[PDB]
C-alpha cells in the first residue's frame, strides 16, 4: 500500500489502499482496477510486457517486491519436493546439503531456464513420490494441527 | 566593593575587617563575586559573614578563603553571643603584618 502506484494507473492506490497486488508469471505489479483493464482486452496479457496468461494468472498478494512474489511462489511449489525431514539422514552434512540444492533450484527457476530443473524434478519424482513425498505430505497436517494448539 | 573602595586606602598596619550580617540568602550582583574574592585576598581584608536562617555556600567560601569565619543564627540568644564574640580583636595571621 506504500507504493506510489501502478505502472499504469495510480489514482486508486494514491487515495485508498484497499487494492492488493496480483501475482502473475510476469512477476509484475498489477491492481484490481487494472485487472479489469486486462480482462476486457487480451484476457490474461500483461499490458506492457504482453506475457500470455492461461486464465488470468491472478492470485492476491501483499508483497510490494515482484522478485519476492516470484521467489515465494516458486518456493511454495518447490517445498512440495524435498520435504523429507532432517532426521531421515544421519550424516551431518546431508542435513543442509539438500536444502542448498533446493535453494539453488529456486534461484535457477526464478531467472534461468527451468527445463533442466523440470527434468531433474522428474528424476526426483520417480523416487520420492513412492514413500517420502506421501509420508511427509500426510504428516504435514498432523504436525500443523498439533503446532496450532 | 563599596567597603573595598573605602578600605583600600586605609593604612597597612591596621586590620581591615568586614562583618556581613546576611539575611536574604540570594545575592544578585552585576559581576561574579568569585573574582572579587581574589581582590579581597590580595587586599588582606578579612570578611567574616554571619548568616541568618541560611548556610549560604558563596559566603562559606568567602569566609574560609578570605580568612574570616562563617556562622548561622541558632536563635536570638546565640546572636548576642556571636556579635559579642566578634567584638574582640581577631588574631593576626601570617598574611597580617604589623
Amino acid at each position: 500500500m506504500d507504493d506510489q502506484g501502478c505502472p499504469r494507473c495510480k489514482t486508486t492506490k494514491y487515495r485508498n489502499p484497499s487494492l492488493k497486488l496480483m501475482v502473475n508469471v510476469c512477476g509484475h505489479t498489477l491492481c484490481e482496477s487494472c485487472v479489469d483493464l486486462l480482462f476486457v482486452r487480451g484476457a490474461g496479457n500483461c499490458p506492457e510486457c504482453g506475457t500470455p496468461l492461461r486464465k488470468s494468472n491472478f492470485r492476491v498478494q501483499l508483497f510490494e517486491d515482484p522478485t519476492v512474489d516470484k521467489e515465494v511462489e516458486i518456493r511454495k511449489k518447490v517445498l512440495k519436493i524435498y520435504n523429507k525431514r532432517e532426521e531421515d539422514f544421519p550424516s551431518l552434512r546431508e542435513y543442509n546439503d539438500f536444502l542448498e540444492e533446493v535453494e539453488e533450484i529456486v534461484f535457477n527457476l526464478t531467472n534461468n531456464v527451468d527445463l533442466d530443473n523440470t527434468k531433474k524434478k522428474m528424476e526426483i519424482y520417480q523416487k520420492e513420490n513412492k514413500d517420502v513425498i506421501q509420508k511427509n505430505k500426510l504428516k504435514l497436517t498432523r504436525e500443523q494441527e498439533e503446532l496450532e494448539e | 566593593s563599596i567597603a573595598m573602595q573605602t578600605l583600600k586606602h586605609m593604612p597597612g598596619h591596621t586590620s581591615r575587617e568586614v562583618l556581613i550580617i546576611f539575611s536574604s540568602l540570594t545575592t544578585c550582583d552585576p559581576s561574579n563575586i568569585y573574582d572579587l574574592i581574589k581582590t579581597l585576598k590580595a587586599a588582606k581584608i578579612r570578611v567574616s559573614v554571619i548568616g541568618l536562617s541560611a548556610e549560604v555556600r558563596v559566603c562559606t567560601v568567602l569566609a574560609r578563603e578570605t580568612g574570616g569565619t562563617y556562622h548561622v543564627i541558632l536563635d536570638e540568644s546565640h546572636y548576642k553571643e556571636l556579635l559579642t564574640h566578634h567584638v574582640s580583636p581577631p588574631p593576626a595571621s601570617s598574611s597580617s603584618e604589623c
Binding site: 521467489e71 511454495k76 551431518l92 543442509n96 535453494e103 | 540570594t26
Partner: protein, 714 residues
C-alpha cells in the same frame, strides 16, 4: 588503619569507619566465605566503594586461589572514573604500608570512541562511526595489505601492539582511562587493546554493564577465564531495565527502509566482487561448509552449520524474504499485537523461512559481510540490527514477545510505525553471569526492598541485609508533605493531575521552600508532559514569577544539548548566591547521570510519585508476564517501580563527606505504609511519624530549623 575483621585483618586508608561499615564488611566477608551470589545495599554513594575494594583486596591476599579477580562494574564512565580514583588511593596506601610494589594490576575498560589515539577517528564522536572506522583499520584485509606495505593508511598502533604487547605484558600499576590514553600514545600501542589483553592477567577490571551483559560484546571479554571471580555491580538497582535493553531490539519503518537500501548496496558489491575477485573470496564457502557480534549467550549460541544459506546470493535472498515479511507485518494497521511464538510460526508458514536456518542468520551475516571487504559497518548497521532481531526471534521466545505498534504514542496519526521486541524477564539475559561466576555481589544504593530482586532475577541469595548510615550528626532529614495550606489531598493521581488546586499547592510549596532553602535545589516531576502542564499553570498564575524573583529557575528538556547547557549554568548558579531551581523528570537521563553533592541539590523535591504511563504496551507484557511467572502482583511491581525510581532520584544529596541536605516528597502517597515500607531502610528509619504528613507550612518551618541545626559545625 588496620581493621581486625572477623575473617582476617584488612587494611583501610581513611582514619575512621562508621558502624555501618563494620556491618558491611562482615556481611560481605560472610558472602565471600560462602562463595555464593548475594545482594546488599549501602546508603553512601562514596565510602562503600573503598570499603568494598579494601575487603576484596584483603580477601584476595588471604585466599588468592578462592578469587581469581574482581570485576567491578559501574553505571557510567564518568562514574567509574571516580572508582578508579578510589582504587588508586587505596593502592598507594597499601604500597606505602608494605614498603614495596606487589604483583597487583587494576584497570578500566571503555569504548574505543571514549579512548583512542588515531587522529582520523579522534574528530568523530559517534560510537558506531568509531567502531566501523577501527574495524576498517584493523581489518584482516588491512592487516594482510599492511604486510604488503602498499600505499594506504594503515593504523600503526594495533600493528605495533601486536608486535610488542603480545610478547610483553604490562608488569603492574593502576591506569585511569585518561592516563591509559597517555600510556598508549607513549608506547605506540592501543589504550584499548592493551587493556583488553591485560584482562587475561589483571587483578581488578572495571567496566559498565553493557561490557558484561549484552552477549554480543560481553562474552568475548568475560570468557570462562574468570571461572571463580568476584563480580560486583555498583548502584545497579536499575539492573533489570539495562538487562532488558541488552535484549530488546526496536525495528522501525525508517530503519527498515535503510536496511533495504543497504541490502541493494550489498547485492551490487557482491556483483562487483564476483567480477573482480571470486576464487579467493569463495574459499569462505569451503570454510562455511566445514563450519556486530551474535546476541546468543554461551549455551544458547549454536555453531553446528550455517544452514540452507551457504552462499552470498542465497543469504541475500533470505534477508530479502525476511525483510519483506517484517515490512508487511509492520505496515499492517491494527491494534497492538503480541506474538512471541506465533510470529515465528507465521513467518515460517507465510514466507517459508525455517527457524533453524533463521537461527544462524546474524552469524552468517557477520562472516559474509566480512568477506565483502566493506568500507565500514556503520553504513550497514541497520541491517545488522535487523539480523540480530532475526536470529534472536528464531533463537527463543519462551520469555519474550514481539509487540507491533502501527501507531506511535503522542501522535494521532504518524507514518513511522515501530515494532518492539521487548523482553519481559531479566533472568534470561543475566543467567550466564550468575552461573559462570561463583558469586556476584549486587551492591546498590537507594535499593528498594531486596525481597523482590530474587523473584525478578532467578538466583539464590546468601545474605539479605539492609545497612543504615550512622553518623554523629543527622545529615539527612527527609519529610513527606501531603496536606497543603488548604488541608487538601495533594496526591498526583492521573485523575487528580488536572486539579488546579493541587497544582497551586505544589507551586506555593516550591515558592516557600525556595525562599528558605539555600542556593541549589532540584525538583523532579513524573513526566515531561506533566511538568510542562504544571509549569504552564504556574506561569499563568503569579507563583512562577515570584519563584523567579526569589531564585533562578532552570528547566529540563528532552534534547541532550539543552539539558547539558542548562545543567552547566545551574552549577554556576549554585556556586554563586543566585541559587537555582532545576526542574527535571525522574526518568530523565539527567536524573540518573547527575550526582548531587554538598552545595548541589541541597533540598531534593519530589513532585508526585514517579509512575510510568499506564498505556505503554511494552510494560504490559513486562508486567503481566511477571504476574504469571515469579508471582508478583501488578500493583506490587508498579509501586516497586515507583519507589525504586524515587529512591534513585532522591538519594543523591547524601553522596558523601557528610554534607547536610533534606529530601521533601510533595505527595501524600509516600505517607502510605506500603510506600514507606518499600522505601530504603536508611531513609525510612530517619523518617518519623511526627514529620510524616507535615502541612506545607509546617514542613517549611521544620526545614528551616533543620537547616539551622546543620549550619553550625560538628
Amino acid at each position: 588503619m588496620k581493621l581486625n575483621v572477623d575473617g582476617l585483618l584488612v587494611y583501610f586508608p581513611y582514619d575512621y569507619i562508621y558502624p555501618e561499615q563494620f556491618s558491611y564488611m562482615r556481611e560481605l566477608k560472610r558472602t565471600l566465605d560462602a562463595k555464593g551470589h548475594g545482594v546488599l545495599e549501602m546508603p553512601s554513594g562514596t565510602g562503600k566503594t573503598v570499603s568494598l575494594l579494601a575487603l576484596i583486596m584483603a580477601y584476595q591476599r588471604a585466599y588468592p586461589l578462592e578469587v581469581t579477580k574482581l570485576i567491578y562494574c559501574s553505571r557510567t564512565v564518568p562514574e567509574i572514573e571516580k572508582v578508579i580514583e578510589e582504587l588508586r588511593k587505596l593502592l598507594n596506601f597499601y604500597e606505602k604500608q608494605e614498603g614495596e610494589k606487589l604483583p597487583f594490576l587494576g584497570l578500566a575498560l571503555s569504548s574505543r570512541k571514549n579512548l583512542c589515539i588515531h587522529p582520523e577517528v579522534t574528530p568523530l564522536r559517534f560510537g558506531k562511526d568509531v567502531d566501523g572506522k577501527c574495524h576498517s583499520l584493523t581489518a584482516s584485509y588491512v592487516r594482510a595489505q599492511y604486510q604488503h606495505d602498499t600505499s594506504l593508511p594503515h593504523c600503526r598502533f594495533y600493528e605495533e601492539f601486536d608486535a610488542h604487547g603480545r610478547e610483553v605484558p604490562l608488569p603492574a600499576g593502576i591506569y585511569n582511562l585518561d592516563d591509559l590514553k597517555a600510556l598508549g600514545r607513549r608506547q605506540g600501542w592501543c589504550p584499548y587493546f592493551l587493556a583488553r589483553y591485560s584482562i587475561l592477567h589483571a587483578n581488578v577490571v572495571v567496566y559498565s554493564y553493557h561490557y558484561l551483559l549484552d552477549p554480543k560484546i560481553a562474552d568475548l571479554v568475560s570468557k570462562e577465564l574468570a571461572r571463580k571471580a568476584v563480580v560486583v555491580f555498583d548502584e545497579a538497582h536499575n539492573i533489570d531495565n539495562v538487562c532488558i535493553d541488552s535484549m530488546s531490539v526496536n525495528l522501525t519503518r525508517r530503519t527498515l527502509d535503510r536496511c533495504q537500501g543497504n541490502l541493494e548496496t550489498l547485492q551490487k558489491t557482491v556483483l562487483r566482487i564476483k567480477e573482480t575477485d571470486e576464487q579467493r573470496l569463495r574459499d569462505e564457502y569451503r570454510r562455511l561448509v566445514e563450519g556486530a557480534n551474535p546476541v546468543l549467550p554461551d549455551e544458547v549460541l549454536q555453531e553446528a552449520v550455517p544452514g540452507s544459506i551457504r552462499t552470498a546470493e542465497h543469504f541475500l535472498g533470505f534477508l530479502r524474504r525476511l525483510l519483506e515479511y517484517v515490512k508487511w507485518r509492520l505496515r499492517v494497521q491494527h491494534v497492538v499485537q503480541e506474538s512471541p511464538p506465533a510470529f515465528l510460526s507465521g513467518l515460517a508458514q507465510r514466507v517459508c523461512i525455517q527457524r533453524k536456518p533463521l537461527r544462524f542468520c546474524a552469524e552468517r551475516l557477520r562472516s559474509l559481510l566480512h568477506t565483502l571487504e566493506i568500507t565500514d559497518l556503520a553504513d550497514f548497521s541497520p541491517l545488522t540490527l535487523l539480523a540480530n532481531f532475526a536470529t534472536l526471534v528464531s533463537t527463543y521466545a519462551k520469555g519474550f514477545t514481539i509487540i507491533i505498534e502501527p501507531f506511535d504514542d503522542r501522535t494521532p496519526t504518524i507514518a513511522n510505525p515501530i515494532l518492539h521486541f521487548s523482553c519481559m524477564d531479566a533472568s534470561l539475559a543475566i543467567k550466564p553471569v550468575f552461573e559462570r561466576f561463583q558469586s556476584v555481589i549486587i551492591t546498590s544504593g537507594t535499593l528498594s526492598p531486596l525481597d523482590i530482586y530474587p523473584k525478578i532475577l532467578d538466583f539464590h541469595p546468601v545474605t539479605m541485609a539492609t545497612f543504615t548510615m550512622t553518623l554523629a550528626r543527622v545529615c539527612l532529614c527527609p519529610m513527606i508533605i501531603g496536606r497543603g495550606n488548604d488541608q487538601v489531598a495533594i496526591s498526583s493521581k492521573f485523575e487528580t493531575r488536572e486539579d488546579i488546586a493541587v497544582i497551586r499547592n505544589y507551586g506555593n510549596l516550591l515558592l516557600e521552600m525556595s525562599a528558605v532553602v539555600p542556593d541549589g535545589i532540584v525538583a523532579f516531576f513524573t513526566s515531561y508532559q506533566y511538568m510542562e502542564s504544571t509549569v504552564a499553570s504556574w506561569y499563568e498564575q503569579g507563583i512562577l514569577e515570584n519563584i523567579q524573583r526569589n531564585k533562578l529557575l532552570f528547566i529540563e528538556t528532552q534534547d541532550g544539548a539543552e539539558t547539558s547547557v542548562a545543567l552547566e549554568k545551574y552549577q554556576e548558579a549554585c556556586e554563586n548566591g543566585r541559587g537555582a531551581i532545576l526542574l527535571s523528570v525522574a526518568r530523565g537521563k539527567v536524573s540518573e547521570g547527575i550526582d548531587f553533592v554538598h552545595h548541589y541539590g541541597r533540598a531534593v523535591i519530589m513532585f508526585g510519585v514517579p509512575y510510568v504511563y499506564t498505556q505503554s504496551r511494552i510494560l504490559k507484557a513486562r508486567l503481566e508476564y511477571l504476574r504469571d511467572q515469579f508471582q508478583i502482583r501488578e500493583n506490587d511491581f508498579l509501586t516497586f517501580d515507583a519507589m525504586r525510581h524515587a529512591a534513585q532520584c532522591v538519594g543523591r544529596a547524601i553522596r558523601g563527606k557528610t554534607d547536610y541536605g533534606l529530601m521533601v516528597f510533595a505527595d501524600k502517597r509516600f505517607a502510605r505504609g506500603d510506600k514507606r515500607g518499600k522505601l530504603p531502610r536508611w531513609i525510612q528509619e530517619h523518617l518519623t511519624d511526627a514529620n510524616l504528613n507535615l502541612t506545607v507550612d509546617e514542613g517549611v518551618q521544620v526545614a528551616k530549623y533543620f537547616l539551622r541545626q546543620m549550619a553550625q559545625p560538628f
